[PDB]
Amino acid sequence: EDEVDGWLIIDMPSDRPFKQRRSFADRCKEVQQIRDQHPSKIPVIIERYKGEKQLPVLDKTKFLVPDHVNMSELVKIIRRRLQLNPTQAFFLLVNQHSMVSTPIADIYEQEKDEDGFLYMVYASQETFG
């Protein structure tokens, strides 16, 4: 959402989140093709949490993940790419809850968006729920 700590966050279009820069038809079409071409891989969107104030910005948004890699392994990969030390808090959240040894393929069938992408947000703090 566009609401963070009582602020309505307005962004220029190219600074908006993936779901707002790209139409649903365009997202769904891209998933369908990537699932055809790489059925052994999960299409994942990883974005910095709108209100993150500590963690650096990731150079990629779209990730094609081998489907038997588990969540704990994806975290290490993203931690490694952001060159985070093990003492820095880092959370990779799927629909607002944190990642776990379940294969990403199970998570995808359980938590994928209507457009067929799996959405994830990273942040230095867990969100209460």
Structure tokens at 68: 């038997």
Residues found in the chain: 129
d(CA 42, CA 63) in angstroms, rounded, equals 8
Q: Is residue 128 part of a domain?
A: no
Q: Are strands 7-8 and 62-66 parallel, antiparallel or unpaired?
A: unpaired
Q: Domain with 19 in it: what CATH number?
A: 3.10.20.90
Phi-psi region of 83 (alpha: psi -120 to 50; beta: other; left: phi over 0): left
Total structural domains in the chain?
1
Rounded-to-integer distance, Cα 86 and Cα 23, Å: 37
Residue 27 resides in a domain? yes
* Cα dist from 15 to 30, 99, 115, whole Å: 21, 26, 21
Characterise 9 by phi-psi region: left (phi > 0), alpha (psi -120 to 50), beta (else).
beta
In a domain? residue 22: yes
Residue 74 lies in a domain: yes
Experimental determination approach used: X-ray
Q: 37, exposed or middle or buried, with CB in 10 Å at 0-12, 13-18, 19+? A: exposed
**Domain contains 51:** yes
Resolution (A): 1.9
Helix (H, G, I), strand (E, B) or coil at 45: strand
Determine the straight-line distance between the first and last CA of the chain, rounded to whole angstroms: 16
Sign, Cα dihedral of 107, 110, 115, 120? negative
User: Is 117 within a domain?
Assistant: yes
- Asked if residues 107 and 120 have their Cβ atoms less than 8 Å apart, the reply is no
Residue 129 lies in a domain: no
Closest CA to 119 of 95, 102, 99: 95
Give 44: exposed, middle or buried? Use CB within 10 Å, 0-12, 13-18, 19+. buried
Decide if 47 contacts 18 (C-beta within 8 A): yes
Range of the domain at 73: 3-123
Distance CA 77, CA 125 (A): 18
Question: Closest Cα partner for 112 from 35, 8, 1?
Answer: 35
Has residue 118 been placed in a domain?
A: yes
